[PDB]
């Protein structure tokens, strides 16, 4: 693989006590603690940009203003594909020596700084090379370091004209050096469509490579592909989590909706996954009637539709975001019917915990049986298979995965029984609600009372909302 | 009704040639031409804030730098409920005279300015009162005008602490004057959840009243209620459209999802309305395979689910946003079944054009007929009712409203027939796709080819995508 960033071990910086967060060329930093993201970007500027090193470090630049500690930010680089990667050649041409033949792939770039009290100016002492144990003397011919011929920081901070012309300027002038775009909040004066355009140029075109993107709007993350997403936790003590966000060719067709839905959820402290928009309407009504500040204390309703949760689960778990999923046990037929049914409702929850896909179970449904009787038989079979796999359901509850008894609507009817009958005035309100999920769900929500909302919220079969709200 | 702003007739300003856009206390300005929104906010500052009047007008402050023309911005106020509206008392206590007894409700506040060439300083000559024809001499005791005791502009431009403490400061200090918050892009350094919080305090709490909000992120418009949404058109010649955005008590329950979906669509030049997420997946795949820049040249996929389009149609039409709707003719039963069916697929399209709701039509479906035969009978009835109302369908095509022959999936099968059979390998792929819309639609999209996408795009039954793409 081409040359890629690997890790940065920021220690005793303005806010970073001791963090070793992985990197990979295309980087995205977001989340809480805007000062944390700003400090991370300025740490990269200190490690790579000469325009920031010359000012040195101050008393405030250290962690808790404690001048005793030493700033040590160590960028880690991975080198491979020497004969075809131009940037690898750019990095290894300037470095003369200090590269042990044992490990020609790894390359450290550290930055040691100790504060002196006789002058109140912490000197930036670059010490880069290939091994942490042994460092040779850096040339440092005056103000320009040897690193200055390799890594030049192009700082973008607000105007689409500048973004459009930086491509031309770098292509025609900065070919020799490696460009590292440290973009900090480019959504300041860009429209939603402008944010989409900038995301398309960033995450798809090769003109922006090795870029560190700071964003606060989900629109800038609509085209994420093989990047490294970095999320800063909400605590004042900065904790950052990293995840390779790459879409498989299986999800390539649905990549647009996948990214559009996941980008908004990336900024939520707690994310709840749902299948259909009727579930969205019901959960939104319940939350508005019990806790309208769910979006405020950290919450989201991620509508995934079909596909699988595997990509969503990996992305949400790697960033450390609270993981909540409520799903419906659905038995879908495939190829020849009448005895062929998959277990997507359960096959998903198995795939989230790994294991293996269940075989296509066979249900003996007579041909003459149809309509209400067929649905009753399917519900009985779903109840039987749910009662059979009690251990798997227990593991899902232990791993914050919620699976319905048969379907979501049956759980809703169990939580509130008389309210459904009063609203729909039918002997079988569940069947009527399944007849047209959207319109009937809207009608149910419009006539849904606060007491009914509280009953739904406090029921154990709807514990997803309780987990989303939190303490 | 309480005192409310009514209109501002900005003439010959920095970019506004001649515009008379309505106002109402809670105002939102967004869209293209960020300079246009900035000029509008500075026009309000000139008309109300003394901190901007003292600098006067410059050569650049006029339209096309033509000093011959005269700046004339005329704010229009509506006065009512005198005995209970404190702000009405605040406005009418300072004004002594100049209020004709014939019209005590309307109140103009103009601002005339002519450029002199002997000093190169356009004097701001305030002329306010109650009638355009006759104006009495304004007191103007020095630097502070008589208006300065009524309207004080609180300019907010980046930090949630300032927003939190402006409430306290205005409540404890600015009780006597009328506060007019001219908020310009508060999303500069606010998170998505912070934007939601600010929107909640703005559009719900009474502490922010008479505020002019400029936004570029849809997250700030998640709580819109009885405000006046102002959209600037994309042309360099500024055109602004206004609309009262108020939710009826019928839509109050679904208000959260309504606003969440509509806020994003508000920033799109062209908006296409869809019902289900499977439609979203299909349209996204087709667009990505024919025109990935649909989000760039102006486009959106508004998922409305159930409810009605009436609120959406009114909002999108009033702002002047291109209106595109693709819908499915669905016959939903109500109360006692077997002969009772509504025409939501057609009742909607009728309600969008006004008229009256069709009566609940009766379909003679025998009880023994079920499953495939019942669906076939329903499709035949839908085809018959579509062929019956050719004139209504022609009007919908004339008004950019697209109604399916029977359903969307049937139109998709008509557009591409062999591709569906190849992908699903079933004698009736449409029935299988309706069996589980989400998963089967995902499977179809994953195996959908570029030639099939082009065929779907160029077919007349999918003209919604062609209209969304445009020339």
Residue numbers in the entry:
A (entry chain D), B (entry chain C): -1 to 156, 263 to 575
Question: What does the study report here?
Answer:
The Gabija system is a newly discovered bacterial immune system that consists of GajA and GajB. GajA is an OLD nucleases family protein, while GajB belongs to the SF1 helicases. The Gabija complex has sequence-specific DNA nuclease activity and prefers circular rather than linear DNA as substrate, its activity is more sensitive to concentrations change of nucleotides compared to GajA alone. Our data suggest a mechanism of Gabija immunity: the nuclease activity of Gabija complex is inhibited under physiological conditions, while it is activated by depletion of NTP and dNTP upon the replication and transcription of invading phages and cleave the circular DNA to prevent phage DNA replication.
Here we report the cryo-EM structure of the Gabija complex from Bacillus cereus VD045 at 3.6 Å, which provides the direct evidence of interactions between GajA and GajB. The resolved structure shows that the Gabija complex adopts an octameric ring structure with four GajA and four GajB. The whole Gabija complex resembles an octameric ring with three 2-fold symmetry axes. SEC-MALS results show that individual GajA and GajB exist in the form of tetramer and monomer respectively, supporting the hypothesis that the octameric ring of Gabija complex is formed though two steps: the tetramer formation of GajA and subsequent octamer formation of Gabija complex. The interactions within GajA1-GajB1 are mediated by the ATPase domain of GajA and the 1A, 1B domains of GajB. Despite being present in the cryo-EM protein sample, domain 2A and 2B could not be traced in the electron density map, demonstrating that this region is quite flexible in the Gabija complex. Size exclusion chromatography demonstrates that the NTR region of GajB indeed binds to GajA, while the CTR region of GajB doesn’t bind to GajA.
